């Protein structure tokens, strides 16, 4: 379960990453309108 | 220690579930400009 | 490993309480028109 907790960790570390760069580029986007 | 653990990164992957949704409705709604 | 996995998901929870504010902001701006 631990393993397998840690490969989850992993994936929504991973989602967060792009979820900042996707919120910065939506800020500016939204800036622009 | 594991079962708060695992309530937690449940509670994450829905949050992140729920911006990820967010997110591509906003990218869409604001479009290239 | 589960301590670090711990310290992990606690900065995580933390910086997807950040995004949500952020996305609540340009859901916002953004609106319904």
Redesign the interface.
């Known amino acids: ?2 393993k397998q ?2 490969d ?2 992993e994936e ?2 991973s ?2 990453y792009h ?2 760069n ?2 910065a580029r ?2 500016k ?2 800036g ?2």
Chains 1, 2, 3 share one sequence.
Do not use: F, G
């Open positions: 379960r631990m907790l840690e989850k960790v929504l570390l989602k967060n979820l900042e996707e919120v939506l800020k986007l939204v622009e309108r």
